[PDB]
Coordinates of C-alpha atoms and ligand atoms in Angstrom, one line a residue:
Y99 CA 76.4 40.6 -29.3
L100 CA 74.0 38.0 -30.8
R101 CA 70.4 37.5 -29.9
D102 CA 67.0 36.4 -31.3
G103 CA 65.6 39.3 -33.3
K104 CA 61.9 39.0 -32.4
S105 CA 62.3 38.5 -28.6
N106 CA 65.7 40.2 -28.2
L107 CA 66.8 37.2 -26.0
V108 CA 70.1 35.5 -26.1
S109 CA 68.4 32.3 -25.0
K110 CA 65.0 31.8 -26.6
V111 CA 62.5 28.9 -26.1
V112 CA 60.7 28.0 -29.4
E113 CA 57.5 26.1 -29.2
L114 CA 56.5 24.6 -32.5
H115 CA 52.8 24.6 -33.0
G116 CA 52.8 24.1 -36.7
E117 CA 55.2 22.9 -39.4
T118 CA 57.4 26.0 -39.5
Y119 CA 58.7 28.8 -37.2
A120 CA 60.2 31.9 -38.6
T121 CA 62.4 34.5 -36.8
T122 CA 65.6 36.5 -37.3
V123 CA 69.0 36.3 -35.7
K124 CA 70.2 39.7 -34.8
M125 CA 73.8 41.0 -34.2
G126 CA 73.9 44.3 -32.3
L127 CA 76.4 46.8 -33.6
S128 CA 78.6 49.1 -31.5
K129 CA 79.1 51.8 -34.1
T130 CA 77.2 53.2 -37.0
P131 CA 78.2 50.9 -39.8
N132 CA 80.0 51.6 -43.1
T133 CA 80.0 50.1 -46.5
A134 CA 82.3 47.3 -45.2
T135 CA 80.4 46.2 -42.1
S136 CA 79.5 42.6 -42.6
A137 CA 79.0 39.3 -40.7
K138 CA 77.5 35.8 -41.1
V139 CA 75.9 33.3 -38.7
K140 CA 76.2 29.5 -38.6
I141 CA 74.9 26.7 -36.4
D142 CA 77.8 25.9 -34.0
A143 CA 77.3 22.3 -33.0
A144 CA 80.5 22.1 -31.1
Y145 CA 79.4 24.9 -28.8
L146 CA 76.4 22.7 -27.6
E147 CA 78.8 20.5 -25.5
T148 CA 80.2 23.7 -23.8
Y149 CA 76.7 25.0 -23.2
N150 CA 75.4 21.8 -21.7
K151 CA 78.4 21.6 -19.4
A152 CA 77.9 25.2 -18.2
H153 CA 74.2 24.7 -17.4
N154 CA 74.3 21.0 -16.3
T155 CA 71.8 20.3 -19.1
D156 CA 71.6 17.6 -21.7
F157 CA 69.9 19.1 -24.7
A158 CA 70.3 17.2 -28.0
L159 CA 71.2 19.1 -31.2
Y160 CA 68.1 19.9 -33.3
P161 CA 68.5 18.3 -36.8
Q162 CA 70.6 20.8 -38.8
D163 CA 68.7 20.0 -42.0
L164 CA 65.5 21.4 -40.4
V165 CA 67.1 24.9 -39.9
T166 CA 67.6 27.3 -42.8
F167 CA 69.1 30.8 -42.9
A168 CA 68.3 33.2 -45.7
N169 CA 71.2 34.5 -47.8
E170 CA 73.5 31.7 -46.8
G171 CA 73.5 33.2 -43.2
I172 CA 74.9 36.6 -44.3
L173 CA 73.6 39.3 -42.1
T174 CA 71.8 42.3 -43.7
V175 CA 73.1 45.5 -42.0
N176 CA 70.5 48.2 -40.9
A177 CA 72.7 51.3 -40.3
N178 CA 69.7 53.2 -38.9
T179 CA 69.1 50.7 -36.1
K180 CA 72.7 49.7 -35.3
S181 CA 72.0 46.1 -36.0
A182 CA 72.3 43.4 -38.7
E183 CA 69.9 40.5 -39.1
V184 CA 69.2 37.4 -41.1
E185 CA 66.0 35.4 -41.4
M186 CA 66.0 31.9 -39.8
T187 CA 63.4 29.2 -40.4
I188 CA 62.9 26.2 -38.1
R189 CA 60.9 23.3 -39.7
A190 CA 59.2 20.6 -37.6
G191 CA 60.7 17.3 -38.4
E192 CA 60.0 13.6 -38.3
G193 CA 61.7 11.2 -35.9
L194 CA 61.8 13.8 -33.2
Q195 CA 60.6 13.0 -29.7
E196 CA 57.6 14.5 -27.9
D197 CA 58.5 16.2 -24.6
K198 CA 62.2 16.7 -25.3
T199 CA 64.1 20.0 -25.7
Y200 CA 66.5 20.4 -28.6
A201 CA 69.1 23.1 -29.1
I202 CA 70.1 25.3 -32.0
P203 CA 73.4 27.1 -31.0
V204 CA 74.1 29.9 -33.4
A205 CA 77.4 31.7 -33.7
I206 CA 78.7 34.9 -35.4
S207 CA 81.4 34.3 -38.0
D208 CA 83.4 36.2 -40.6
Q209 CA 82.7 39.6 -39.1
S210 CA 84.2 42.8 -40.4
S211 CA 86.9 44.6 -38.4
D212 CA 84.4 47.3 -37.2
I213 CA 82.7 44.6 -35.1
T214 CA 84.3 43.8 -31.7
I215 CA 83.1 40.6 -30.1
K216 CA 83.9 40.8 -26.4
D217 CA 83.7 37.1 -25.5
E218 CA 82.4 33.7 -26.6
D219 CA 79.1 34.5 -24.9
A220 CA 78.5 37.6 -27.1
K221 CA 79.4 35.4 -30.1
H222 CA 76.5 33.0 -29.5
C223 CA 72.8 32.8 -29.0
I224 CA 70.7 29.7 -28.5
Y225 CA 67.3 28.5 -29.5
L226 CA 65.7 25.8 -27.2
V227 CA 63.2 24.0 -29.4
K228 CA 60.2 21.9 -28.3
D229 CA 57.7 20.1 -30.6
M230 CA 54.3 21.2 -29.3
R231 CA 52.2 20.2 -32.3
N232 CA 50.4 17.4 -30.5
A233 CA 50.2 19.1 -27.1
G234 CA 48.0 21.7 -28.7
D235 CA 44.8 22.0 -26.7
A236 CA 45.8 25.1 -24.7
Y237 CA 47.2 26.9 -27.7
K238 CA 44.7 29.6 -28.6
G239 CA 46.7 31.4 -31.3
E240 CA 49.5 33.9 -32.0
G241 CA 49.5 37.0 -29.7
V242 CA 46.4 36.2 -27.6
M243 CA 46.3 36.7 -23.8
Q244 CA 47.1 33.6 -21.8
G245 CA 45.9 32.2 -18.5
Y246 CA 47.8 31.5 -15.3
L247 CA 46.1 29.5 -12.6
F248 CA 47.1 28.6 -9.0
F249 CA 45.5 25.5 -7.4
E250 CA 45.5 25.1 -3.6
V251 CA 46.5 21.5 -3.9
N252 CA 45.8 21.0 -0.2
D253 CA 42.1 20.9 -1.2
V254 CA 41.7 20.8 -5.0
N255 CA 42.8 18.3 -7.7
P256 CA 44.7 20.2 -10.5
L257 CA 42.9 18.0 -13.1
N258 CA 40.1 20.6 -12.7
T259 CA 42.1 22.7 -15.2
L260 CA 40.2 20.5 -17.7
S261 CA 36.9 21.8 -16.5
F262 CA 37.7 25.1 -18.2
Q263 CA 37.3 25.1 -22.1
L264 CA 36.1 27.7 -24.6
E265 CA 33.1 26.9 -26.6
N266 CA 35.5 26.2 -29.5
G267 CA 37.0 23.4 -27.3
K268 CA 40.3 25.1 -26.4
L269 CA 41.6 24.9 -22.8
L270 CA 41.5 28.3 -21.1
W271 CA 44.4 28.0 -18.7
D272 CA 47.9 27.9 -20.4
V273 CA 49.9 27.7 -17.2
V274 CA 48.9 26.1 -13.8
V275 CA 50.8 26.3 -10.5
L276 CA 50.7 23.5 -7.8
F277 CA 50.5 25.8 -4.8
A278 CA 52.7 25.1 -3.0
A279 CA 55.8 23.3 -2.0
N280 CA 57.9 25.1 0.6
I281 CA 61.4 26.3 1.3
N282 CA 62.5 25.2 4.8
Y283 CA 65.7 24.7 6.7
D284 CA 67.4 21.3 6.5
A285 CA 69.4 21.0 9.8
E286 CA 71.4 17.9 8.7
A287 CA 72.7 19.8 5.7
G288 CA 72.8 23.3 7.2
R289 CA 71.1 24.6 4.1
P290 CA 67.5 25.2 2.7
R291 CA 65.6 22.4 1.0
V292 CA 62.4 21.9 -0.9
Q293 CA 59.8 20.6 1.6
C294 CA 56.6 19.1 0.2
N295 CA 53.6 18.6 2.5
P296 CA 51.8 15.2 2.1
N297 CA 49.4 16.7 -0.4
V298 CA 52.1 18.1 -2.6
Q299 CA 54.1 14.9 -2.2
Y300 CA 51.1 12.7 -3.2
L301 CA 50.6 14.8 -6.4
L302 CA 54.3 14.4 -7.3
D303 CA 54.3 10.7 -6.5
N304 CA 51.2 10.3 -8.7
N305 CA 52.3 12.8 -11.4
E306 CA 51.6 10.2 -14.2
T307 CA 47.9 10.2 -13.5
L308 CA 47.2 13.6 -11.8
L309 CA 49.7 16.0 -13.6
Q310 CA 51.0 14.6 -16.9
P311 CA 47.5 14.5 -18.4
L312 CA 47.5 18.3 -18.3
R313 CA 50.9 18.5 -20.0
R314 CA 49.7 16.0 -22.7
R315 CA 47.2 18.7 -23.7
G316 CA 49.7 21.5 -23.7
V317 CA 49.2 23.0 -20.2
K318 CA 52.4 24.0 -18.5
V319 CA 52.5 22.6 -15.0
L320 CA 54.7 24.6 -12.5
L321 CA 55.7 23.8 -9.0
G322 CA 54.8 26.6 -6.6
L323 CA 57.4 27.4 -4.0
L324 CA 56.4 29.4 -0.8
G325 CA 58.0 30.5 2.4
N326 CA 57.0 28.4 5.4
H327 CA 57.8 29.9 8.8
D328 CA 61.5 29.4 9.4
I329 CA 64.8 31.2 8.8
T330 CA 64.8 30.3 5.1
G331 CA 63.0 32.3 2.4
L332 CA 63.0 32.9 -1.4
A333 CA 64.3 36.5 -1.0
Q334 CA 66.9 35.9 1.6
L335 CA 69.3 33.3 0.1
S336 CA 73.0 34.3 -0.3
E337 CA 74.6 34.0 -3.8
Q338 CA 75.8 30.5 -2.9
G339 CA 72.6 29.5 -1.1
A340 CA 70.6 30.6 -4.2
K341 CA 72.8 28.7 -6.6
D342 CA 72.3 25.5 -4.5
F343 CA 68.6 25.9 -4.0
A344 CA 68.1 26.7 -7.7
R345 CA 69.7 23.4 -8.6
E346 CA 67.3 21.6 -6.2
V347 CA 64.3 23.2 -7.8
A348 CA 65.6 22.3 -11.2
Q349 CA 66.1 18.7 -10.0
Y350 CA 62.4 18.5 -8.9
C351 CA 61.2 19.8 -12.3
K352 CA 63.4 17.2 -14.0
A353 CA 62.5 14.3 -11.7
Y354 CA 58.7 14.9 -12.0
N355 CA 58.8 16.2 -15.6
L356 CA 57.3 19.7 -14.8
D357 CA 57.6 22.9 -16.7
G358 CA 59.0 25.3 -14.2
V359 CA 58.4 27.2 -11.0
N360 CA 56.5 30.0 -9.3
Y361 CA 58.2 31.9 -6.5
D362 CA 56.1 33.5 -3.7
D363 CA 58.0 35.3 -1.0
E364 CA 55.6 35.0 1.9
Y365 CA 55.5 33.5 5.4
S366 CA 59.3 33.3 6.0
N367 CA 60.8 34.4 9.3
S368 CA 63.9 36.5 9.7
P369 CA 67.1 34.7 8.5
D370 CA 70.0 33.6 10.6
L371 CA 72.7 35.9 9.1
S372 CA 75.5 33.7 10.4
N373 CA 74.4 30.9 8.0
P374 CA 76.3 31.2 4.7
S375 CA 73.3 30.1 2.7
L376 CA 71.3 33.1 3.9
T377 CA 71.5 36.8 3.6
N378 CA 69.6 40.0 4.4
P379 CA 66.1 39.8 2.9
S380 CA 65.9 41.9 -0.3
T381 CA 64.8 42.1 -3.8
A382 CA 68.5 41.6 -5.0
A383 CA 68.6 38.2 -3.3
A384 CA 65.3 37.3 -4.8
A385 CA 66.5 38.3 -8.3
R386 CA 69.7 36.3 -7.7
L387 CA 67.5 33.2 -7.1
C388 CA 65.4 33.8 -10.2
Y389 CA 68.6 34.2 -12.3
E390 CA 70.2 31.1 -10.9
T391 CA 67.0 29.1 -11.4
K392 CA 66.9 30.1 -15.0
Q393 CA 70.5 29.1 -15.5
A394 CA 69.7 25.7 -14.1
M395 CA 66.6 25.1 -16.3
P396 CA 66.9 27.5 -19.2
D397 CA 64.1 25.7 -21.1
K398 CA 61.6 26.0 -18.3
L399 CA 59.5 28.9 -16.9
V400 CA 60.8 31.0 -14.0
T401 CA 57.8 33.0 -12.7
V402 CA 57.1 35.2 -9.7
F403 CA 54.2 36.5 -7.6
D404 CA 54.8 40.2 -7.1
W405 CA 54.5 40.4 -3.3
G406 CA 57.1 40.7 -0.5
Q407 CA 60.6 41.2 -1.8
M408 CA 60.3 38.8 -4.7
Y409 CA 60.4 41.2 -7.7
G410 CA 61.9 44.5 -8.7
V411 CA 65.7 44.2 -9.3
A412 CA 66.2 44.2 -13.1
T413 CA 69.8 42.9 -13.6
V414 CA 71.9 40.1 -12.1
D415 CA 75.6 39.8 -13.1
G416 CA 74.9 42.1 -16.1
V417 CA 72.0 40.0 -17.4
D418 CA 68.6 41.6 -17.9
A419 CA 65.4 40.3 -16.2
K420 CA 63.9 39.5 -19.6
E421 CA 66.2 36.5 -19.7
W422 CA 65.2 35.1 -16.3
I423 CA 61.6 36.3 -15.5
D424 CA 59.2 34.7 -17.9
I425 CA 55.9 35.7 -16.2
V426 CA 55.1 38.0 -13.3
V427 CA 51.7 38.0 -11.7
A428 CA 50.4 40.5 -9.3
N429 CA 48.4 40.7 -6.1
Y430 CA 44.6 40.7 -6.4
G431 CA 43.4 44.1 -7.6
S432 CA 46.7 45.1 -9.2
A433 CA 48.3 44.7 -12.6
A434 CA 52.0 43.6 -12.8
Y435 CA 54.6 45.9 -14.3
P436 CA 57.7 45.0 -16.3
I437 CA 61.3 45.7 -15.3
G438 CA 64.5 45.8 -17.3
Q439 CA 63.7 45.1 -20.9
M440 CA 60.6 43.1 -20.1
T441 CA 57.3 44.2 -21.7
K442 CA 53.8 43.9 -20.4
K443 CA 53.5 40.8 -22.5
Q444 CA 55.3 39.1 -19.5
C445 CA 52.8 40.6 -17.0
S446 CA 49.3 39.9 -15.7
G447 CA 46.7 42.6 -16.3
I448 CA 44.2 41.0 -13.7
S449 CA 44.5 38.7 -10.7
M450 CA 41.3 37.0 -9.5
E451 CA 41.0 35.5 -6.0
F452 CA 38.5 32.8 -6.8
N453 CA 38.2 31.5 -3.2
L454 CA 37.6 34.9 -1.5
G455 CA 36.2 37.0 -4.3
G456 CA 38.6 40.0 -4.8
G457 CA 40.4 41.2 -8.0
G458 CA 37.5 41.7 -10.4
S459 CA 36.3 39.7 -13.3
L460 CA 37.5 38.7 -16.8
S461 CA 34.6 40.6 -18.4
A462 CA 34.4 41.8 -22.0
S463 CA 35.4 45.3 -20.9
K464 CA 38.3 44.1 -18.9
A465 CA 39.5 41.9 -21.6
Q466 CA 39.6 44.7 -24.1
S467 CA 41.3 47.0 -21.6
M468 CA 44.0 44.5 -21.0
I469 CA 44.6 44.0 -24.8
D470 CA 44.8 47.7 -25.2
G471 CA 47.3 47.9 -22.4
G472 CA 49.6 45.2 -24.0
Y473 CA 49.2 42.7 -21.1
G474 CA 50.1 39.0 -21.8
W475 CA 48.4 37.3 -18.9
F476 CA 45.4 37.0 -16.7
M477 CA 45.8 35.2 -13.3
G478 CA 43.4 33.3 -11.1
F479 CA 43.9 31.8 -7.6
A480 CA 42.3 28.8 -5.8
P481 CA 39.3 27.8 -8.0
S482 CA 37.3 24.9 -6.7
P483 CA 34.4 22.8 -7.9
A484 CA 32.2 23.9 -5.0
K485 CA 32.6 27.5 -6.1
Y486 CA 32.3 26.9 -9.9
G487 CA 29.1 29.0 -10.0
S488 CA 31.1 32.1 -8.8
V489 CA 34.3 31.2 -10.7
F490 CA 32.6 30.8 -14.1
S491 CA 30.4 33.9 -13.6
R492 CA 33.6 35.9 -13.3
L493 CA 34.8 34.5 -16.7
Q494 CA 31.6 35.5 -18.7
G495 CA 32.2 37.7 -21.8
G496 CA 36.0 37.9 -21.7
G497 CA 36.7 34.9 -23.9
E498 CA 34.7 36.3 -26.8
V499 CA 37.0 39.4 -26.7
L500 CA 40.3 37.5 -26.2
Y501 CA 39.7 34.5 -28.5
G502 CA 36.4 34.9 -30.3
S503 CA 34.9 32.1 -28.1
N504 CA 33.5 32.4 -24.6
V505 CA 34.3 30.1 -21.8
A506 CA 31.8 27.2 -21.8
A507 CA 29.7 26.3 -18.7
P508 CA 31.5 23.4 -16.8
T509 CA 30.2 19.9 -17.2
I510 CA 33.0 17.8 -15.5
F511 CA 35.0 18.2 -12.2
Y512 CA 37.5 16.1 -10.3
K513 CA 37.7 15.2 -6.7
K514 CA 40.9 15.4 -4.7
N515 CA 43.5 12.7 -5.6
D516 CA 41.0 11.0 -7.9
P517 CA 41.6 10.7 -11.7
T518 CA 37.9 10.1 -12.5
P519 CA 36.0 12.8 -14.3
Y520 CA 32.7 13.4 -12.4
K521 CA 29.6 15.2 -13.7
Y522 CA 29.3 18.9 -12.8
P523 CA 27.1 19.8 -10.9
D524 CA 25.2 16.5 -10.3
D525 CA 28.1 14.7 -8.5
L526 CA 28.8 17.8 -6.3
Ligands
LIG214 C1 49.7 33.6 -4.9 C2 49.0 34.0 -3.6 O1 47.8 34.2 -3.5 N1 49.8 34.0 -2.5 C3 49.3 34.2 -1.1 C4 48.6 33.0 -0.5 O2 49.5 32.3 0.3 C5 47.3 33.3 0.2 O3 46.6 32.1 0.5 C6 46.1 32.0 1.8 O4 47.2 32.0 2.7 C7 46.8 31.9 4.1 C8 48.1 31.9 4.9 O5 48.8 30.7 4.7 C9 50.0 30.6 5.4 O6 49.8 30.5 6.8 C10 49.0 29.4 7.2 C11 48.9 29.5 8.7 O7 50.1 29.3 9.3 C12 50.3 29.3 10.7 O8 49.5 28.3 11.3 C13 49.8 27.0 11.0 C14 48.9 26.1 11.7 O9 47.5 26.2 11.2 C15 51.3 26.7 11.4 O10 51.6 25.4 11.0 C16 52.2 27.7 10.7 O11 53.5 27.6 11.3 C17 51.7 29.1 11.0 O12 52.0 29.4 12.4 C18 49.6 28.1 6.7 O13 48.8 27.0 7.1 C19 49.9 28.1 5.2 O14 50.6 26.9 4.8 C20 49.8 25.8 4.3 O15 49.3 26.1 3.0 C21 50.4 26.3 2.0 C22 49.7 26.5 0.7 O16 48.7 27.5 0.8 C23 51.4 25.2 2.0 O17 52.5 25.5 1.2 C24 51.9 24.8 3.4 O18 52.7 23.7 3.4 C25 50.7 24.6 4.3 O19 49.9 23.5 3.9 C26 50.7 29.3 4.9 O20 52.0 29.2 5.5 C27 46.0 30.7 4.4 O21 45.4 30.8 5.7 C28 44.8 30.7 3.4 O22 44.1 29.5 3.7 C29 42.8 29.5 3.6 O23 42.3 29.5 2.2 C30 42.8 28.3 1.5 C31 42.3 28.5 0.1 O24 42.9 29.6 -0.6 C32 42.3 27.0 2.1 O25 42.8 25.9 1.5 C33 42.6 27.0 3.6 O26 42.0 25.9 4.2 C34 42.2 28.3 4.3 O27 40.8 28.4 4.3 C35 45.3 30.7 2.0 O28 46.1 29.5 1.8 C36 46.5 34.1 -0.7 C37 45.1 34.4 -0.2 O29 45.2 35.2 1.0 O30 47.1 35.4 -0.9 C38 48.5 35.6 -1.0 O31 48.9 36.2 0.2
CA215 CA1 46.8 16.3 -29.4
CA216 CA1 46.8 37.0 1.1

């Protein structure tokens, strides 16, 4: 089969932060090659219609003139690694649209008889390309650790993400979660639904002013989903129930122009096993939902809190978790761990409970330990302007290690449901 060589993913999201992006396309080999092993790759524009139909997506084709393969797309065989690869360059173009995902479907062609291609799936990989050159204010560089922040939107305006910058002006928090919409039972439909409390609903209704300004500066905004004290839950949907709920989550992220989801399996009660949308609570059911959610929004982030039964099964329908868990964050005091072919670049190395105090600090020591451990993420939960003294104290020193620039003292904060930047601390 064919995949992206750097990530080893068959579906790879590419964020352009500069004028070019370089990678390889890699064909895996089933036998040690010989002098005759050969293959080429090409862009397969016709396959995009098939892909979009299968995923209920609408991606446009990235301009083919902006994509270049080395060596006319002929793959260089590496006999020692059972693979063959070609360099591919993606150039940023003109006349592209901000905030639109484009597709580069790549196909194997002209392969030698020693290569067996099982199906059309193994014959293709896909790059999902986003131009992020202008939504650059959270982008702190190649290979740095990234931040993941939950807001308790019952109480705190997520525009407070903008209170957190390094001295070099970059935004600290790459990803923020609106915590949380709920899963609840819909009796009229006999199935689960997304249920948004009035605070969540107000944010979505007002996404233009209270959420999209974060996305304009490059922050990914995710909808949090959380159990909510009835028979439905994120780790207890049947295969069919998970397919249906995943489509609803994807519809929210499309309707409100968000960047994905966090799943937190807490507070559900026991399921009604006679209901066909439900099943025994388990990590396999949770993994099924994550997989189906990714199939429904392959260019958006599927992330989990490692608690309850939400995380741990590493394959669904033969597909490894690297393809459908983008980020896993752990409980306060723990580091997350990868499953399947994930690496610790998908995992949090610290989780900080900013409202109650546990989980430690993003100190210089801790930052270096996390880098040394290969972690990709640091997580924080429930910051608020009233506690900025404590929150920012727990961020002292780490930024110099992670980025060469410490977190700056806050000077602005936002009040709930109010777009006005107030002066910190004078305005409270
Ligand atoms: C990523 C992560 O940290 N995940 C979790 C967090 O959930 C947890 O946060 C804390 O969670 C507790 C428990 O919240 C759940 O239970 C609440 C109480 O439910 C019961 O009572 C209700 C009546 O008061 C009944 O209606 C209900 O049926 C049940 O009998 C419940 O109110 C809460 O749901 C609300 O909040 C969530 C978002 O948090 C929202 O989706 C719901 O729609 C609803 O609005 C949960 O079901 C909670 O008590 C903690 O709350 C305190 O702290 C927060 C700030 O963090 C304050 O805003 C709040 O005022 C309280 O002071 C907090 O939310 C964290 C930390 O423990 O850890 C992981 O477990
Ligand atoms: Ca800009
Ligand atoms: Ca808790």
